[PDB]
């Protein structure tokens, strides 16, 4: 089977460029898009991660993919955009993974309390 049974690469692993407040490659990274964590493989900072329950606002412009992470992060205390050539694709994939995973590491926030 291989409709969208994608490998760890080609689609989900996107070599991005960590660029901050200038679009300046301040450490061009990866953005490993998974179910719930956006695993950015930095230069020297190692695989940074962005859990989906943190991406306030995530985007895409001309090879620029972004997300406003609403927690503290390894290297992204807020709107942290990367110059991702597959920004479109990445952002998309992300928004789509967002839609299609519902995103839970574990421990559901008691779905429908009614107590």
């Amino acid at each position: 089977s291989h409709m969208d049974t994608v490998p760890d690469n080609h689609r989900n692993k996107f070599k991005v460029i960590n660029v901050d407040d200038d679009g300046n490659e301040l450490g061009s990274g990866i953005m490993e898009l998974t179910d719930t964590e956006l695993i950015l493989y930095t230069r020297k900072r190692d695989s940074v991660k962005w859990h989906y329950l943190c991406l306030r606002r995530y985007g895409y412009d001309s090879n620029l993919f972004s997300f406003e992470s609403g927690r503290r992060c390894q290297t992204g205390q807020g709107i942290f955009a990367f110059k991702c050539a597959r920004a479109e694709e990445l952002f998309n994939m992300l928004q789509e993974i967002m839609q299609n995973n519902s995103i839970n590491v574990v421990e559901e926030p008691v779905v429908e309390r009614n107590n």
């Binding site: 901050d20 407040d21 200038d22 412009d61 620029l64 993919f65 972004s66 709107i79």
Partner: peptide, 23 residues
């Protein structure tokens, strides 16, 4: 607005997550 991250080279027109709205 902030919903575009204007990261120097490029302004990123971002969107908000359905995770906070689909828990």
């Amino acid at each position: 607005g902030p919903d575009a991250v204007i990261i120097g080279m490029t302004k990123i027109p971002v969107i908000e997550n359905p995770q906070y709205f689909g828990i």
